[PDB]
């Protein structure tokens, strides 16, 4: 059949083709375990790695933890299917340059997964 998480990603995958480049190399899936554990699927176009944006707890620290990404290629350029794993509270880091990174990244889609 199909992983509960997996299914809510496959549809996520449909929506990205929905953006449409008729790209032609067919989209890849990470192992089921990674998907159940990972909380969010984001795709970042224009040849750059996804997300990792900070969250300032009650200064700012990093919030989103990455996993494996695949450089699926549209006719022009690499579109990563970055997978984002939401961060557990105790474990955290403090960002530097990255605040600049979150602002200058354009990402086509972010889809909630576990929920």
């Amino acid at each position: 059949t199909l992983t509960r998480a997996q299914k809510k990603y496959a549809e996520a995958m449909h929506e990205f083709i929905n953006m449409v480049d008729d790209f032609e190399e067919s989209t890849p899936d990470f192992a089921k375990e990674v998907l159940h554990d990972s909380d969010y699927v984001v795709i970042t176009k224009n040849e750059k790695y996804a997300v990792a944006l900070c969250s300032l707890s009650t200064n700012l620290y990093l919030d989103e933890k990455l996993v494996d990404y695949s450089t699926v290629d549209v006719n022009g350029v690499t579109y990563y299917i970055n997978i984002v794993e939401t961060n557990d509270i105790d474990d955290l880091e403090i960002a530097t340059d990255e605040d600049e990174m979150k602002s200058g990244n354009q990402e086509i889609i972010l889809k909630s997964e576990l929920k």
Partner: protein, 1360 residues
């Protein structure tokens, strides 16, 4: 006031249930409620309205996959145990501890209780063996071939590696060409293709498929070479994309079937399976046999490419070929390193030494796939000389391959059995115990538990149904003689049959039942219309015509086209010349597949058609659907052996079927109409001039089927009652949560039952442009059917197809719909969109009922459908559009109604039905329960006394009502609207039940007097006496002045009343005020259902070893510092703990008040002995009374009304709701709808003034938010950041400034904080990571409504 009559409103959801209580005057009552607890507050007031929120309810299936996953792994561990047990007695002679070393292979040197080298136990013998047998396959080949006695550990390993990983069981019996060879499975493919396509066969009689496909060339080459033999097949044809799929490529079946959304399918994708089901649904069940003949071919090629041996060199083709692959990998690697040392030596280190990279190091050591890897070295090979060979292997996908890999799904257990069988036959003279267990061992590999038999349980499994024949442990040897195969199967059949939803207790037919197929064709056939010349109006089929057609077209064709029907039958048989056909398009969807399948194999036409053979024939199908199993099928066809040849009989069992229908045989034929004695299927055949359809027959209240269905849904206890209804698991939770709320409310109301309960069910399914492509797709095929040049002349783009005016422009081919006039694409702003059937008659806003004209005046002077003149002028033009599918049939008819005398009483009585009756069957079940629960008393004749009337509304009426009167809704603000919706139903529902009581039968659950609607209707405007209406739209009596289709204005009194009762239903001036008042009330009860988490203990990623002690061991003894483990464990619930603990080197007891997360795994433990558990986790001097269970979403109130919800033991969610004033609400609606208003021009301007004249509400709104965030959200940096950002765009448009003002609400939203942006600018969420404040805060326990609470000040703990 006195009034203890009250009605209840409800808006039932998957994540919410809004509820409201109203009085006869549409007010929401107010009461003080006893506040239990230790605080000083001992009562508060609350308005009787609110909404219960809750996480969705999740399916069992997810758990099921885990269960089988678990079952598979457990029974593999048993296979090996059957091997070792046989081996062990002998092995002990040869090695004392050999098995033991394997047992402990996992463990580190420090924990092993034996020597660290597993097979031989000394480093000399081991290292030797690995240079001699670099893989297991080298060992397997040697054992399969050699004639020498072999060491007994090595014989074991070989055998245990064939048994452990034993390949597939897709193929039954011995391998042979018809089940395994590439050509045969190619033939079956084209055979499957031509069966589908008699009209356009493929002939490949000369074509050598095996060679073409088999040869070592890139998938894409082999695809060209094959289509090269088939003139008249395009490389991306339907047949070409089928081979593409067969080679493992990703073909797009979109073009092949004219799909709106593309259908890229790839056999290696896991999601292929329901990717296929996605395609199948669109193109029907019929093609499944194609894609399965493709799949088997897919196995055939892969298996052909894995075994690359000339047989008879070895009885181990597999192992020998893996060895080849080994050697090939060696050769090619060595050269490669040569070619990189020479040409690109700076990159040598990264490629072969770095496991971070996708290069070879990552491939082996860094978990790179073969796919990732090729794509790494592909550019690098391309840069170099001497790579020519390597690129060929790469682009053939054959470079540096590993032996265990994704392909091996396609390796049949028979092949493994071949090598298994050989090794035994070499050795069984050197080891008599192998001669003596040869058949036992082979059985270990080949025996499989049957599908029907299920878990082999002994009364301790809820799932299992199997029946023992003796009380002894079941082993693959004794199985047939311990398990009662027949009995166990029999209990199989019973459990895996679903019952007819309409008529449970009755099984569902197989989807391929001949009767289900006859039924399905006779249902489609019954709605078909035709015109020959002098045809009167468009005629239906005679029953006798139908019975000849099926006899001639259907029982002569798998599928029948209109062309045959138009030509094969109408001209040929009825001696017609040219017959227009309507009601079907292109071809029939339902055909008698099972009739043709059985005719081929049985070659006895009389037999199929006897119709007393139907029973024999329906049992047959039933077994071929029920069972895959060969043995069982044989047992279950035994009694028709006499009837049939042993040529056919064999061929019978080789036909298999899958799938079940929705319906019971008893449905289709068993039940009869009381008046006519005609079954359902009996009506489908002959119904006369009036030709009814199955959906109609059930709905049609003039017949006995609807009523017996009702009478048949009979079902006791509660959860059983809830369980029974059809619908999603999430909606069963909401139905259950609804009824509890009603119970609490009744209790709240003095235990008085209400007057009425209004139900509606909210829809939250906005999945996506699924429709925006179809819009474009409709236009293209349309614009192509017309041969117009419009799309060329005016460029196509499907996202601006969301402007309805723009959409209708195209659908009408750039012309006026009421005149032979062009429109100007640019000037649409000028034009009016008109509703064909005026709004006054019914509320239809669908594109189906709308048209674009330069001015709505062009329609005619009427209040009817458009004028007889326009109709006669355009009818031709409209006919072309309909034939081209730019307009629907219903739309054509509606325009042309005037021809037919216009809107009749019958028409109007139809709009009324349309508006009232809720079409979804699941709300009716919800109604039944509540009516059943509420109404309990019977009178002195045993008639049920209905004290409460349970009413179901279409969601639309309320949604329309909000839009009509400016009670606008903006979900992004808060959660109140759930509750408001309930209120508004309760209001609209009760009004309606007062003003139109004779219409009760339509919208009240119960059995009532059905009234012909027409009687209600007035013949004229002047007729207005006991006539309910002359204008259909049932919501008219709310409005003061209604506009007609021609600008005229018909007024209505402020104070409507039912004429017959005289009861007063609505004061237009007074009553709306009450509604506006209710909606702007600030105190609404919003309860998040608190929940203990259930499910997995933690994430499922097995991680590599860490010093860190957070990770969780996978076996009790496996320290994750040594063996790795899982990282994050789900918290079941938290638990306030008050105790004293050691604080420093002194070990002195400091008192703490802390919050502890109980993991799902720990729950058992802590819930047996909570103190002991807590004491072992460090706390001492624990106080038992004090400890409090605190699940997810537990509610605390801080100072100043600020509140928090518990997400985990360390984190909170925002607990407050922002009740914004009602005036700003509609402001933010209108503002952000500024362009696509969808309202009449004169008020569509009137509302835009209001926005322009209230842009100072923008600033007032931000200060609403500003004071809110400072008070509760308490995330100052973020509010500073937005406070500047709204300054930065104060001069941007109001439609843009508003639409971003709506995102900003995320900040104030209830629940965990999220990231959000205003325009470009982006705000990072402020997370509430301290749960310290809560400890001294106030808890609040809430009943389901949130009306009864218990308040517990936590700052009174810490003492005695």
């Amino acid at each position: 006031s006195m009034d203890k009559k009250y009605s209840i409103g409800l808006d039932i959801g998957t994540n919410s249930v809004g509820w409201a209580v109203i009085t006869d005057e549409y007010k929401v009552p107010s009461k003080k409620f006893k506040v239990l607890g230790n605080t000083d507050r001992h009562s508060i007031k609350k308005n009787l309205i609110g909404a219960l929120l809750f996480d969705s309810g999740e399916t069992a299936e997810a758990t099921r996959l885990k269960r089988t996953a678990r079952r598979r792994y457990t029974r593999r561990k048993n296979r090996i145990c059957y091997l070792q047990e046989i081996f062990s007695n002998e092995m002990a002679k040869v090695d004392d501890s050999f098995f033991h070393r394997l047992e402990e292979s996992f463990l580190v040197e420090e924990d092993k209780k034996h020597e660290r080298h597993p097979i031989f136990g000394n480093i000399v013998d081991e290292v030797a063996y690995h240079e001699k047998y670099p893989t297991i396959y080298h060992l397997r080949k040697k054992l399969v071939d050699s004639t020498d006695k072999a060491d007994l550990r090595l014989i074991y390993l070989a055998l245990a590696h064939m048994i452990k990983f034993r390949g597939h069981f897709l193929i039954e019996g011995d391998l042979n060409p018809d089940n395994s060879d590439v050509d045969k499975l190619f033939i079956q493919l084209v055979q499957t293709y031509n069966q589908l396509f008699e009209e356009n066969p493929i002939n490949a009689s000369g074509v050598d498929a095996k060679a073409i496909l088999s040869a070592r060339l890139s998938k894409s080459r082999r695809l060209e070479n094959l289509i090269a033999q088939l003139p008249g097949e395009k490389k991306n044809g339907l047949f070409g994309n089928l081979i593409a799929l067969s080679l493992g490529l990703t073909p797009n079946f979109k073009s092949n079937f004219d799909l709106a959304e593309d259908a890229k399918l790839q056999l290696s994708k896991d999601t292929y399976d329901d990717d296929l089901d996605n395609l199948l649904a669109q193109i029907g069940d019929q093609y499944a046999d194609l894609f399965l003949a493709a799949k088997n071919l897919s196995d055939a090629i892969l298996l052909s490419d894995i075994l690359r041996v000339n047989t008879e060199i070895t009885k181990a083709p597999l192992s020998a070929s893996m060895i080849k692959r080994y050697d090939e990998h060696h050769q090619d690697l060595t050269l490669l390193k040569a070619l990189v040392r020479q040409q690109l030596p700076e990159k040598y280190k990264e490629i072969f030494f770095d496991q971070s990279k996708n290069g070879y190091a990552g491939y082996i050591d860094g978990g790179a796939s073969q796919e990732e890897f090729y794509k790494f070295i592909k550019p690098i090979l391309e840069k170099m000389d001497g790579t020519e060979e390597l690129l060929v292997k790469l682009n053939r996908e054959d470079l540096l391959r590993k032996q265990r890999t994704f392909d091996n799904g396609s390796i049949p257990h028979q092949i493994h059995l071949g090598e298994l069988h050989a090794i035994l036959r070499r050795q069984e003279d050197f080891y008599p115990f192998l001669k003596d267990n040869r058949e036992k061992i082979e059985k270990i590999l080949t025996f499989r538990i049957p599908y029907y038999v299920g878990p082999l349980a002994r009364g301790n499994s809820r799932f299992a149904w199997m029946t023992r024949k003796s009380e002894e442990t079941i082993t693959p040897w004794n199985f047939e003689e311990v398990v009662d195969k027949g009995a166990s199967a029999q209990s199989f059949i019973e459990r895996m049959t679903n019952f007819d939803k309409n008529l449970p207790n009755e099984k569902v037919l197989p989807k391929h039942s001949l009767l289900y197929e006859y039924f399905t064709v006779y249902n489609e056939l019954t709605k078909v219309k035709y015109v020959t010349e002098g045809m009167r109006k468009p005629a239906f089929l005679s029953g006798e015509q139908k019975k000849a057609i099926v006899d001639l077209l259907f029982k002569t064709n798998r599928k029948v086209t209109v062309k045959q029907l138009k030509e094969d039958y109408f001209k040929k048989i009825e001696c017609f010349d040219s017959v227009e056909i309507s009601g079907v398009e292109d071809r029939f969807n339902a055909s008698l597949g099972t009739y043709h399948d059985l005719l081929k194999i049985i070659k006895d036409k009389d037999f199929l058609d006897n119709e007393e053979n139907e029973d024999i024939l329906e049992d047959i199908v039933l077994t071929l659907t029920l069972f895959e199993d060969r043995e069982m099928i044989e047992e279950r066809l035994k009694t028709y052996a006499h009837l049939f040849d042993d040529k056919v009989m064999k061929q019978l069992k080789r036909r298999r079927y899958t799938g079940w229908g929705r319906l019971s045989r008893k449905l289709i034929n068993g039940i009869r109409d009381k008046q006519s004695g005609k079954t359902i299927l009996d009506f489908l055949k002959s119904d006369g001039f009036a030709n009814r359809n199955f959906m109609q027959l059930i709905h049609d209240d003039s017949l006995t089927f609807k009523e017996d269905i009702q009478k048949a849904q009979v079902s006791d206890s509660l959860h059983e009652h809830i369980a029974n209804l059809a619908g999603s698991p999430a909606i069963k939770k909401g139905i259950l949560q609804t009824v509890k709320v009603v119970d609490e409310l009744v209790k709240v109301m003095g235990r008085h039952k209400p007057e009425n309960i209004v139900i509606e069910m909210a829809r939250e399914n906005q999945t996506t442009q699924k429709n925006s492509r179809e819009r474009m797709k409709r236009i293209e095929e349309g614009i192509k059917e017309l041969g117009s040049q419009i799309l060329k002349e005016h460029p196509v783009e499907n996202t601006q197809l969301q402007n309805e005016k723009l959409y209708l422009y195209y659908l009408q081919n750039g012309r006026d719909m009421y005149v032979d006039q062009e429109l100007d694409i640019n000037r649409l702003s000028d034009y009016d969109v008109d509703h064909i059937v005026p709004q006054s008659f019914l509320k239809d806003d669908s594109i189906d009922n709308k048209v674009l004209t330069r001015s709505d005046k062009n329609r005619g002077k009427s209040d009817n459908v458009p004028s007889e003149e326009v109709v006669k002028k355009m009818k031709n033009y409209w006919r072309q559009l309909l034939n081209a599918k730019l307009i629907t049939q219903r739309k054509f008819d509606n325009l042309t109604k005037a021809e037919r005398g216009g809107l009749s009483e019958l028409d109007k009585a139809g709009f009324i039905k349309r508006q009232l009756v809720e079409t979804r069957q699941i709300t009716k079940h919800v109604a039944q329960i509540l009516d059943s629960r509420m109404n309990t008393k019977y009178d002195e004749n045993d008639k049920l006394i209905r004290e409460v009337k349970v009413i179901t509304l279409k969601s639309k009426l309320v949604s329309d009502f909000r839009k009509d009167f400016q009670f606008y809704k903006v979900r992004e603000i808060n959660n109140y609207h759930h509750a408001h919706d309930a209120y508004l139903n309760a209001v609209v529902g009760t009004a309606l039940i007062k003003k139109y009581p004779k219409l009760e039968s339509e919208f009240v659950y119960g059995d009532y007097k059905v009234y012909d609607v027409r009687k209600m209707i007035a013949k004229s405007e002047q007729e207005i006496t006991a006539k309910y209406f002359f204008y259909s739209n049932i919501m008219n009596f709310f409005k003061t002045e209604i506009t007609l289709a021609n600008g005229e204005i018909r007024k209505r009194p402020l104070i409507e009343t039912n004429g017959e009762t005289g009861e007063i239903v609505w004061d237009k001036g007074r009553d709306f005020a009450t509604v506006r008042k209710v909606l702007s009330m600030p105190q609404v009860n919003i309860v998040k259902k608190t929940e203990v988490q259930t499910g997995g203990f933690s994430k499922e990623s097995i991680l590599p070893k860490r010093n860190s002690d957070k990770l969780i061991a996978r076996k009790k003894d496996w320290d994750p510092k040594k063996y790795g483990g899982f990282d994050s464990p789900t918290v079941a619930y938290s638990v306030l703990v008050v105790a004293k603990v050691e604080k420093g080197k002194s070990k002195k007891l400091k008192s703490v008040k802390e919050l502890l997360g109980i993991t799902i795994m720990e729950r058992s433990s802590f819930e047996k002995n909570p103190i002991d558990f807590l004491e072992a986790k460090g706390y001492k001097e624990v106080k038992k009374d004090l400890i409090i269970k605190l699940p997810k979403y537990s509610l605390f109130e801080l100072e100043n009304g600020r509140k928090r919800m518990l997400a985990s033991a360390g984190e909170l969610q925002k607990g407050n709701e922002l009740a914004l004033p009602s005036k700003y609400v509609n402001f933010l609606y209108l503002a952000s709808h500024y362009e696509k208003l969808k309202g009449s021009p004169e008020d569509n301007e009137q509302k835009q003034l209001f926005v322009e004249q209230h842009k100072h509400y923008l600033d007032e709104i931000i200060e609403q938010i500003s004071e809110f965030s400072k008070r509760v959200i308490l995330a100052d940096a973020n509010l500073d950041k937005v406070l500047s950002a709204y300054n930065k765009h104060r001069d941007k448009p109001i439609r843009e400034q508003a639409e971003n003002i709506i995102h900003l609400f995320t900040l104030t939203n209830l629940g965990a904080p999220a990231a959000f942006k205003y325009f470009d600018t982006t705000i990072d969420r402020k997370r509430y990571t301290s749960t310290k404040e809560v400890l001294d805060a106030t808890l609040i326990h809430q009943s389901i409504t949130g009306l009864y609470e218990t308040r517990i000040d936590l700052s009174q703990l810490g003492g005695d």
